[PDB]
């Protein structure tokens, strides 16, 4: 009950005559009324510092250039590949023929089959971009 008067950036120590004490360095309290401050996330290794820590906000991490964040709060870093590639365990590998990837991350997915709906292919697809189908036989020859 008495600890509620300690705001964010402090922790409550009832052994003090002035119970609300500010957080030590590398430490934060984001809510207030807490008996401790949490230790600032350090963005170590494959992590990088986006917003440095403060007394009231944890440090925010993003990944190093050649990586991309995954998970809540950038908890993970998956390696970036190029466009037209996908990430396999042996490294970044080009998309196989018939597949494409328009992102610097993820897997290759196949082209949309224009032949299934009876349409010719207007522009050739590539590793980076999908195909663009021509008109259906109903518009191309009957309307």
């Amino acid at each position: 009950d008495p600890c509620s008067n300690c705001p964010a950036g402090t922790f409550c120590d009832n052994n003090r005559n002035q119970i609300c004490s500010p957080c030590p360095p590398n430490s934060f309290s984001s809510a207030g009324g807490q008996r401790t401050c949490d230790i600032c996330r350090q963005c170590k290794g494959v992590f990088r510092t986006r917003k440095e820590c403060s007394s009231t906000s944890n440090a925010e991490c993003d990944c190093t250039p050649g990586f991309h964040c995954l998970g809540a709060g950038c908890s993970m870093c998956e390696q970036d590949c190029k466009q037209g590639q996908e990430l396999t365990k042996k490294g970044c590998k080009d998309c196989c023929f018939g597949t494409f990837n328009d992102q610097k991350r993820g897997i290759c997915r196949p082209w949309t089959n224009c032949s299934l709906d009876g349409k010719s292919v207007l522009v050739n697809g590539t590793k980076e971009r999908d195909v663009v189908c021509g008109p259906s036989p109903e518009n191309l020859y009957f309307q």
């Epitope: 995954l70 998970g71 809540a72 908890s75 993970m76 998956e78 365990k89 993820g106 897997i107 997915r109």
Partner: antibody, heavy 116, light 109 residues
């Protein structure tokens, strides 16, 4: 904050049709795969298939090929898991997760319960 | 399609390390991811890409993957680690993800 909010619990009858949704907010919904995962009562996790909402490309595991339909209306950042006729064997918990391999976000899961 | 085998039950004593295997044909050619799940709660990943650990996961969680077995290792296992553990992998061949059968790690009390 990136979030995946799923539909409420469903209580259907055998033969009825059902479609649950998975609304993904806080990120570019079109360029992240959405995978649907099944978990029977007291059983493990079963990957059902994924979908890329950018072009609605869908994929399925052999256990669910031709059993369910996965769809995505990327104009409202929502993926779907659709049945045509529910069997009593379909009582389970259905999670949607973001990603093809690493599932870094999970919805709260939609419980379905088919019975007379 | 692809099948990943993990023992249904592994026990361990307080403070001693637990190992949980995930066996599949040439799983060592794929990235292995381990997910922890507790009653009434969505699965939360503990190890991704064989060995890497996400931020917020205790350093006692360990992972390796080679040959036909990926394994999750938990040093100094504490009572909070008693939960179901699922290994997972994605293979480009067929472009599907598969979960292991699940292992219930029991911390003996």
């Amino acid at each position: 904050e990136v979030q995946l909010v799923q539909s409420g619990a469903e209580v259907k009858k055998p033969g009825e049709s059902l479609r649950i949704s998975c609304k993904g907010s806080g990120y570019s919904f079109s360029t992240y795969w959405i995978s649907w995962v099944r978990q029977m009562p007291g059983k493990g996790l079963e990957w059902m298939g994924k979908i890329y909402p950018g072009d609605s490309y869908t994929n399925y595991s052999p256990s669910f090929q031709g059993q369910v339909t996965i769809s995505a209306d990327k104009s409202i950042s929502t993926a779907y898991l659709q049945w045509s006729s529910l069997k009593a064997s379909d009582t389970a918990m259905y999670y949607c997760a973001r990603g093809y391999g690493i599932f870094d976000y999970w919805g709260q899961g939609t419980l379905v319960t088919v019975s007379s | 399609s692809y099948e990943l085998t993990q023992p249904p039950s592994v026990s361990v004593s307080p403070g001693q390390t637990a190992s949980i295997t995930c066996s599949g044909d040439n799983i060592g050619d794929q990235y292995a991811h381990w997910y922890q799940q507790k009653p009434g709660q969505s699965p939360v990943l503990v190890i991704y890409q064989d060995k890497n650990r996400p931020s917020g996961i205790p350093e006692r969680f360990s992972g390796s993957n080679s040959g036909n077995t990926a394994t999750l290792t938990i040093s100094g296992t504490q009572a909070m680690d008693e939960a179901d553990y699922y290994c997972a992998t994605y293979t480009g061949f067929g472009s599907l993800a598969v979960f292991g059968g699940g292992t219930k790690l029991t911390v003996l009390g």
